[PDB]
Amino acid sequence: CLGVGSCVDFAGCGYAVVCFX
């Protein structure tokens, strides 16, 4: 869940700057 749009964190926001984390 971040303001980035490269990947997703699936933390409710649906935005992650990484996919390996």
CB-based contact 1:8 (threshold 8 Å)? no
Q: Where are the alpha helices (DSSP H) in 1-21?
A: none
User: Distance (Å, rounded) from C-alpha 13 to C-alpha 11?
Assistant: 6
Residue 17 amino acid letter: V
Experimental technique: NMR
Residue 21: exposed, middle, or buried by beta-carbon count in 10 A (0-12, 13-18, 19+)? Answer: exposed
3-state secondary structure of 7: strand
CB-based contact 12:2 (threshold 8 Å)? no
Query: Given the structure tokens 């700057």, which residue do they identify?
Result: 17
